[PDB]
Design a protein around this motif. Structure first.
Motif, mmCIF file in Angstrom:
data_model
loop_
_atom_site.group_PDB
_atom_site.id
_atom_site.type_symbol
_atom_site.label_atom_id
_atom_site.label_comp_id
_atom_site.label_asym_id
_atom_site.label_seq_id
_atom_site.Cartn_x
_atom_site.Cartn_y
_atom_site.Cartn_z
ATOM 1 N N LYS A 1 0.827 -1.201 0.000
ATOM 2 C CA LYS A 1 0.000 0.000 0.000
ATOM 3 C C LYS A 1 0.865 1.256 0.000
ATOM 4 O O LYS A 1 0.724 2.118 -0.869
ATOM 5 C CB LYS A 1 -0.926 0.005 1.219
ATOM 6 C CG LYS A 1 -1.737 -1.270 1.373
ATOM 7 C CD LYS A 1 -3.191 -1.055 0.988
ATOM 8 C CE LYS A 1 -3.931 -2.376 0.844
ATOM 9 N NZ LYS A 1 -5.365 -2.174 0.496
ATOM 10 N N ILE A 2 1.759 1.354 0.978
ATOM 11 C CA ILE A 2 2.649 2.504 1.087
ATOM 12 C C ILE A 2 3.476 2.682 -0.181
ATOM 13 O O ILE A 2 3.524 3.770 -0.755
ATOM 14 C CB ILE A 2 3.598 2.368 2.292
ATOM 15 C CG1 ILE A 2 2.798 2.240 3.589
ATOM 16 C CG2 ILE A 2 4.542 3.560 2.360
ATOM 17 C CD1 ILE A 2 1.987 3.473 3.921
ATOM 18 N N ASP B 1 3.040 1.566 -3.311
ATOM 19 C CA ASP B 1 2.199 2.002 -4.420
ATOM 20 C C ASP B 1 1.785 3.459 -4.249
ATOM 21 O O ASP B 1 1.835 4.246 -5.195
ATOM 22 C CB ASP B 1 0.958 1.115 -4.524
ATOM 23 C CG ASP B 1 1.223 -0.164 -5.294
ATOM 24 O OD1 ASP B 1 2.398 -0.422 -5.628
ATOM 25 O OD2 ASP B 1 0.255 -0.907 -5.563
ATOM 26 N N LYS B 2 1.375 3.815 -3.035
ATOM 27 C CA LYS B 2 0.952 5.177 -2.738
ATOM 28 C C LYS B 2 2.054 6.176 -3.080
ATOM 29 O O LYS B 2 1.855 7.080 -3.891
ATOM 30 C CB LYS B 2 0.574 5.306 -1.261
ATOM 31 C CG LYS B 2 -0.014 6.659 -0.899
ATOM 32 C CD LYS B 2 0.138 6.954 0.584
ATOM 33 C CE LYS B 2 -0.944 6.268 1.403
ATOM 34 N NZ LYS B 2 -0.577 6.178 2.843
ATOM 35 N N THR C 1 2.843 6.518 -6.771
ATOM 36 C CA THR C 1 1.837 7.311 -7.465
ATOM 37 C C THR C 1 1.842 8.755 -6.978
ATOM 38 O O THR C 1 1.322 9.650 -7.646
ATOM 39 C CB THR C 1 0.426 6.721 -7.274
ATOM 40 O OG1 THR C 1 0.447 5.311 -7.522
ATOM 41 C CG2 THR C 1 -0.571 7.391 -8.208
ATOM 42 N N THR C 2 2.432 8.978 -5.808
ATOM 43 C CA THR C 2 2.505 10.314 -5.231
ATOM 44 C C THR C 2 3.702 11.085 -5.776
ATOM 45 O O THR C 2 3.711 12.317 -5.779
ATOM 46 C CB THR C 2 2.602 10.257 -3.694
ATOM 47 O OG1 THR C 2 1.452 9.598 -3.155
ATOM 48 C CG2 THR C 2 2.712 11.657 -3.107
#
Length: 64
Positions: A55-56, A58-59, A62-63
């Protein structure tokens, strides 16, 4: 009978048979859909560590 039991696979026969991970070994989840003493449905899944990690990652990706 050669390959392993990766994510989204039948591991009810073995929870420690699932494939290994980069940080830790996968986790075998089980469920009793109106049949605990009849037939328990289990499947290969990732632990809270692996989940949160992805999650982190990927986040951030994308961030950035």
């Amino acid at each position: 009978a050669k390959a392993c039991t990766p994510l989204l696979h039948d591991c009810s026969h073995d929870r420690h048979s699932c494939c290994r991970g980069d940080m830790f070994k996968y986790v075998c989840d089980c469920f009793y859909p109106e049949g605990e003493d009849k037939t328990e449905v289990c499947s290969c899944q990732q632990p809270k560590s692996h989940k949160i990690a992805e999650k982190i990652i990927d986040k951030a990706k994308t961030t950035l």
